[PDB]
């Protein structure tokens with residue numbers, strides 16, 4: 001699909017991409033973690049896109065294996081959700097990625 005090719009372009013062009021929903025506490029949490037690191041992520045709020053939201057979500061599951069939000073990409077690579085991102089941070093992998 002065109003939506004799949006567009007996601008690939010979005011995540012290769014933007015250092016941090018968070019596919020989010022505005023009401024989700026885990027999305028807020030991961031937004032805050034990147035803010036504390038000095039990053040300004042690109043946020044895509046899937047609940048604020050009309051019927052494109054659920055279509056995008058389906059393509060995200062095909063690409064990433066995940067059906068929850070947040071769905072986080074760093075340096076073009078899928079990293080997971082909030083707890084995945086927090087674990088990557090706790091290990092210093094997240095900052096090593098950002099540093100390269």
Ligand SMILES: N[C@@H](CCC(=O)N[C@@H](CS)C(=O)NCC(=O)O)C(=O)O
Nearest residue numbers: 024025026067068069070081082083
């Ligand atoms: N363990 C996940 C949890 C994320 C989560 O539960 N997200 C909720 C929204 S706040 C969700 O996507 N729910 C949709 C569903 O369960 O299908 C993470 O750390 O990101």
